[PDB]
Amino acid sequence: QYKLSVVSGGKPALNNLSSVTGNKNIARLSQDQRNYIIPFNNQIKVYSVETRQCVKTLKFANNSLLSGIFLQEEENNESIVKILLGDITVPQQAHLITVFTNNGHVIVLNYKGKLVESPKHFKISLADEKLANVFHSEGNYRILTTFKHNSLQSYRLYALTFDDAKKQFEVAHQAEWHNVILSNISSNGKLLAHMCKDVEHKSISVVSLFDDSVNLSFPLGSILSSQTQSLSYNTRYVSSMAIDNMGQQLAVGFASGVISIVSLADLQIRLLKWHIDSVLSLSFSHDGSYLLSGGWEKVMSLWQLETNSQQFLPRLNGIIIDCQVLGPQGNYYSLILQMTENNSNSDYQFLLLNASDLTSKLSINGPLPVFNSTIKHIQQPISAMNTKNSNSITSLNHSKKKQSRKLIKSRRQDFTTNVEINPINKNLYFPHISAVQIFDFYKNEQVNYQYLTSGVNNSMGKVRFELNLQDPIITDLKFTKDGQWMITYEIEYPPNDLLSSKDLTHILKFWTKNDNETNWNLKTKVINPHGISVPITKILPSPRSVNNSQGCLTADNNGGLKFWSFDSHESNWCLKKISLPNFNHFSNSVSLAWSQDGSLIFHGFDDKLQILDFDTFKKFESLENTKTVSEFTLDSEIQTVKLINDTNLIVATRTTLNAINLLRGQVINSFDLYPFVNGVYKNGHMDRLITCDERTGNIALVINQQLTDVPTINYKSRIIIFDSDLSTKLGNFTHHEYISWIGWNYDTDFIFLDIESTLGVVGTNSDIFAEQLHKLSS
Amino acid sequence: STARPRIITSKAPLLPQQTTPEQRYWRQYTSAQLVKEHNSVTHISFNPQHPHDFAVTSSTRVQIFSSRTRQVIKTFSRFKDVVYSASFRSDGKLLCAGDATGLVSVYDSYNPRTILLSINASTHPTHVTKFHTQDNKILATASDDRVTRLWDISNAYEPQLELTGATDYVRTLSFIPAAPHLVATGSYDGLIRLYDTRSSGSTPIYSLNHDQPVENVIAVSPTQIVSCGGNNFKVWDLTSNKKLYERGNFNKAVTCLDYVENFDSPMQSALIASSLDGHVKVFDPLDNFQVKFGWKFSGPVLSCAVSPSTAQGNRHLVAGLSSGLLAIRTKKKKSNNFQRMMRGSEYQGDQEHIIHNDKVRSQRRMRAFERNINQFKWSEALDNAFVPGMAKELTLTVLQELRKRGKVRVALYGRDESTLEPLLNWCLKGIEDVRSASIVADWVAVVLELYGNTLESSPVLQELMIDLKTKVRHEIHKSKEAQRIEGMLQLLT
Amino acid sequence: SNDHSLLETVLNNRDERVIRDTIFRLKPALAVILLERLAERIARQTHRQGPLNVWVKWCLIIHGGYLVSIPNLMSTLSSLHSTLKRRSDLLPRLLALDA
């Protein structure tokens, strides 16, 4: 009776191409600019800039109209590459958008009202080319295409026509550029600049595309200074370029940090030095007298080009990888913020903002999890030095080769994360690096974002050396079972090259909110619970019978346990009970479970599942010795001790999957895990891979990395459910992509998190006068 | 974009004996006054109604002090022998004083010249005189005649009721604060008797056996009363005739008690107790009469009181000693044409449809180290740390912010002899404390890593390094011997 | 009582034989609260740890039976355990510092 679905959205998924700087933001404003049309990897979201709500969502997988374009278990390079606001089929009549994809399909889709069940799609007669973008002007349409020596791409521009047979678009082929390094197109789309690599060095060429108004070219050594040729490669590497709507000036942003406005009629340059790390994004205003720039500091500057006067916007929760003016008068700035505190995923925030008071009108974001490993051709962006948050000017190619080789050859292919569900309002809490994204999945939009550690997380955009510092990692957070308190555990890391650089700090914090306010308040924090330098392998919230669900149980890798509980008298969360053993072996294969009665605790340390009581907090004892088995040595270190109900409990370890009853005190069932989950997850992550219910079963979950005719970069997910002590596989589902976390929301459903973050779920006269007046008064 | 997060002051794990809210409130009773009396201060009462004056009974005079100047506004000196008790009526209009000749004399307060009536009580000394707290026209006087009397102040010839029954030296009365027929009296044989006045009155309805001779009995609730006598005080539920708390936290006999309710305090109720050894202590009736604060005085404290529940001004704790002096600790508390031109600036939007509010709140002023860390002046932030008038946690938090945030080395690059001596001269003081010494360790380690040649050149920081060496030698002897004590009580588990 | 003033005048005496037989003549039911007062004072004032821990080692040596027969040693004199743990926890750090 169980069914699988994908219900909640994913990442925004901009243009993931190299060699396109500037315009990688494929989101559009309307012409009556009241609603903002952004694509996702699962749908087209249409937000409304007046109310900040999503007003229409064109789900791709909802219908075979364009899920037939892509539903593949292996091929996601079919990507959505441009949206246009008009109708390319019939002119002069717009409330519907024409989307060009990266392969050659052109779908015309109505976003006003219900989506039509047969769109106006075509497929243009295209070569092996892969659709860089399209371009619009008055009337006419251009398209640009990429190609196949030194690994560079090659671009080719066509013009379109449609009219004679209404199935095909005919193309014209204006010109080519046989090696392209970097490219940008002006705001009106009237001209485009790019780089060449034609010999001693590269070259720079600008060309108007909708007319032969201008096309010029020059070697960029005449742009570059004489100082830069005896300096580092960052001083001559260029990471951004932009042109204005006349083609009079051009902004070259270098990886050293400087910007240079060249004047294209005479090739005289002007240097703008503010960015202390690499310049990642440039744009001009419409009149060309203001330059927006963004880089590795999280500060959008806008340069008054008359007096060279900056106006700043300093703390933008992500580095600006694209910025551009947007309106007809330039009243909005649209930005893409890369949010690079997690190195395991490229998670972009889309943020336009009105230019008047510089307030974030309609910030857009998908769910932000942090996986244990890097995911799928993910490259942290360019910078000046090779850090733990970026990579230098040399190591991008070697890093992507190494990451592909690591996904192919290696063995510890576990990129699984912990997500929690607030048991009051059913929104899920992705712990980002030193912060949490509170995010509700019945509308897939972020509730808010909150910093929970004390780093330099928000106060400062870190740059070239300072990116080798990391803010403290939130590794555990659990809610108490009434949703009143949030327990979180963080590892505070020290900066290198000093005496205390090799001892971490471990901080356990206790947060509270009432059911109205969206952000939590720290009521207490304990630095070094369990002692100095010792971690917390597992925290477990307590059931509703110990201190009215206001207790937590933290576990060491010594096998020590600490029971903390909130008492109202001394109005704080204090240390109630303690059981510390002092071994000389450590292992982070620790798990914990509690009886629902609140009587006995199952402490699943490595190779050993001890049974403690709660009243004296030592190992369980009955003096009558009624086969009081209070330890279960298993064949390997155990990583889940999940007790489904008070009768029995499922243990999962790295070879087998046992189940043990306690009203009949022996093993009842066992399963084989070693052919599936062998040495691929880190020890302590099967607890987030498998989960349970409170009545209706238990969920195992395995992963098959697919194969060719060697493993590949492609994955498939095999989730299985069991009811009532491993009896029947009454659910055997297969998902087309890697699965990272599964967990039971508190109303008999199980949510899971796809590796590209789609949350899925497994569940159970006067009439004509009225019409013409609503026409003529609108 | 956000606002900038403030620099969080480094708080360590809390040490034992922190400052409780109760002891912060009771510690801001300061600016003590010591007034030398002619003899031992035996009783002190407060005016109830405008609760702003208090009468101190020394020998053969009663002085009303004011609660804003703490000088004697008025004084009552026409007693023949030692005056013993002096209390105000519940309306605060007149003042009764029992005298050692058994002559209760009641004047009106704030007029010492008009003695209103002189009740001639027993020939024995009358030791306690107080009006009813519900009724206005009855006055209860107990004496060294082992019999208390209720007097109607209209008929002041015969007592309207004669509460006998106690075997030795009745020294205290009390009234029960909701039932006005209920008088609890306390004597030097223990045995708090208490009487229903509608009955005969020559027999108590029951008796509470405080084992020591009681010195005072007050009533806290309408139900529970507290009797002090001997080294402890006990509390008694009165609907169930039964003791339920006893605190014996003194060395000598508790001489007096009084009680406060509903006043502006973290403590919702407070019983303070004065105990012949110097101590007056405050006990909180809501968590099981636990002691929260105390004062030590320069001799045996004979009587004490505080300002009443509705004091509304300068609030007082007074304690009169057996040494013969009085200690008060208080806690304190353009043109019409131009205005017609600038009329509207106080309107605040009452009849107006929409009311817009985007004036941001003005936050606390940034200190110089915080704005220098904001302006990325990291060496200037270190310089602003080591000014003299800086708090120790503030120097610690700017050191920790430069440690976590950027670079110790950046903050220490351009230095020499004259500009390192503040850092090391503070590191001498910071190496002693537990909370600072990790940061002091890595800062000293970095500065000797990158200034090892200035060590050779300048001799006047060589001696600073030597003093730092002997400091770390003392501290490492301390951190070794603490581990030895840790082992030697690990042995005793 | 809780008399900090004459507690200070009794433990500013620092002759070792006086401290020794003083704690010997002390009643063992309140050695635990003498040890609590000493623990809180060396927690607050850090230069007292030199002179006052002479008192705390003599209280353990003499009353070695009472506070081994007490059922919760760590729960009853927690402040001593926390003070000595935070005093001796950083010993490797200032070892590296003085090296």
Binding site: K523, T524 | - | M74, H81
Partner: peptide, 25 residues
Amino acid sequence: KDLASATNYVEGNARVTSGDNFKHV
């Protein structure tokens, strides 16, 4: 304050304790 602006970190009057105060049994 803005809706995209993250919540800053603020301890406030949170009681910072260690893991070694065994003041409770």
